[PDB]
Write an enzyme that holds these catalytic residues in place. Sequence first.
Site, mmCIF file in Angstrom:
data_model
loop_
_atom_site.group_PDB
_atom_site.id
_atom_site.type_symbol
_atom_site.label_atom_id
_atom_site.label_comp_id
_atom_site.label_asym_id
_atom_site.label_seq_id
_atom_site.Cartn_x
_atom_site.Cartn_y
_atom_site.Cartn_z
ATOM 1 N N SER A 1 16.440 -46.315 -49.243
ATOM 2 C CA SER A 1 16.872 -47.671 -49.578
ATOM 3 C C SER A 1 15.806 -48.497 -50.291
ATOM 4 C CB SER A 1 17.348 -48.401 -48.323
ATOM 5 O OG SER A 1 18.540 -47.816 -47.820
ATOM 6 N N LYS B 1 16.838 -49.631 -53.724
ATOM 7 C CA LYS B 1 17.669 -50.799 -53.970
ATOM 8 C C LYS B 1 16.933 -51.817 -54.851
ATOM 9 C CE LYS B 1 20.909 -50.441 -50.112
ATOM 10 N NZ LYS B 1 20.416 -49.126 -49.621
ATOM 11 N N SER C 1 20.618 -53.521 -46.167
ATOM 12 C CA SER C 1 20.574 -52.191 -46.785
ATOM 13 C C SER C 1 21.969 -51.580 -46.899
ATOM 14 C CB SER C 1 19.649 -51.249 -46.008
ATOM 15 O OG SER C 1 18.318 -51.718 -45.992
ATOM 16 N N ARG D 1 7.852 -49.477 -38.703
ATOM 17 C CA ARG D 1 7.516 -49.633 -40.114
ATOM 18 C C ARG D 1 6.835 -50.970 -40.363
ATOM 19 N NH1 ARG D 1 13.419 -48.695 -42.413
ATOM 20 N NH2 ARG D 1 13.744 -50.115 -40.646
HETATM 21 C C1 LIG Z 1 18.466 -49.581 -36.038
HETATM 22 O O1 LIG Z 1 19.031 -48.911 -37.190
HETATM 23 C C2 LIG Z 1 19.680 -47.774 -36.944
HETATM 24 O O2 LIG Z 1 19.844 -47.330 -35.835
HETATM 25 C C3 LIG Z 1 20.164 -47.120 -38.190
HETATM 26 C C4 LIG Z 1 20.887 -45.934 -38.138
HETATM 27 C C5 LIG Z 1 21.314 -45.328 -39.306
HETATM 28 C C6 LIG Z 1 20.985 -45.875 -40.534
HETATM 29 C C7 LIG Z 1 20.238 -47.050 -40.613
HETATM 30 C C8 LIG Z 1 19.699 -47.530 -41.910
HETATM 31 C C9 LIG Z 1 20.331 -47.220 -43.116
HETATM 32 C C10 LIG Z 1 19.761 -47.574 -44.326
HETATM 33 C C11 LIG Z 1 18.553 -48.246 -44.356
HETATM 34 C C12 LIG Z 1 17.909 -48.581 -43.169
HETATM 35 C C13 LIG Z 1 16.575 -49.286 -43.188
HETATM 36 O O3 LIG Z 1 16.172 -49.797 -42.113
HETATM 37 O O4 LIG Z 1 15.942 -49.311 -44.271
HETATM 38 C C14 LIG Z 1 18.495 -48.233 -41.956
HETATM 39 C C15 LIG Z 1 19.916 -47.710 -39.426
#
Ligand SMILES: COC(=O)c1cccc(-c2cccc(C(=O)O)c2)c1
Length: 242
Positions: free
Chosen positions: A47, A50, A95, A227
């Site tokens: 992402s 983006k 995202s 992160r």
């Molecule tokens: C707490 O977030 C989750 O559990 C989770 C699971 C599955 C996918 C995503 C996701 C998808 C795309 C970008 C991001 C992000 O952070 O950059 C995070 C998040």
Amino acid sequence: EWQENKSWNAHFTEHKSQGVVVLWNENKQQGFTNNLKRANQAFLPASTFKIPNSLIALDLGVVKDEHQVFKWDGQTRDIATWNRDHNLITAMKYSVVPVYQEFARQIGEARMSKMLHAFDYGNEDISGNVDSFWLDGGIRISATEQISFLRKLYHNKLHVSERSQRIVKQAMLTEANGDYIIRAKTGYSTRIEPKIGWWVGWVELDDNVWFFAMNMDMPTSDGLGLRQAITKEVLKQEKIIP
Ligand SMILES: COC(=O)c1cccc(-c2cccc(C(=O)O)c2)c1
Ligand SMILES: [Cl-]
């Protein structure tokens, strides 16, 4: 020009993780990292893509402005914040992959390929599906390459309009207070090994700008908060933020 500070590794090991932080002091034109090798290893952008995707969509008119509403397609997905209407600002904040997949389809392979070459972005290789190549295609970018791309964006030196670059930098706004402003974008790559998290952007101070790019191993989503947490600890150690 580049200095390796392996003492930042403590910020990763203490959380049973591994990764790299890269910092660039714009005033002094000097870079710092805990791992010179990993700083130059190329990963899927996920992402973080983006940022370039938004620039291209705006400059071609695929996105009119940051207020244009991209209606939810009505397909229930597992991330609740995706099951709603978005504009460029909220789509970046959450995202929202499916909004950006449609951007890429409207941009098309030919124009996407040329624009990434004009941006000197990573390996500039869009091989794969046009609506997912940044998640499971051939495109790759290193932390140092993220810094190089972000520096051009900050200075409005990318080969798109100043307006497009101003809009994307607005949409990158993540945090602001009386001490600093952070403009950045997170990333989470799971479809190709090794699974990693990204955070790339910069810290605006009164009299300087610190660019940063980090990635870290992310075996499960449980560690995503690291992160930002690890990056800020490095910033705090170097007295960039209080
Ligand atoms: C707490 O977030 C989750 O559990 C989770 C699971 C599955 C996918 C995503 C996701 C998808 C795309 C970008 C991001 C992000 O952070 O950059 C995070 C998040
Ligand atoms: Cl702003």
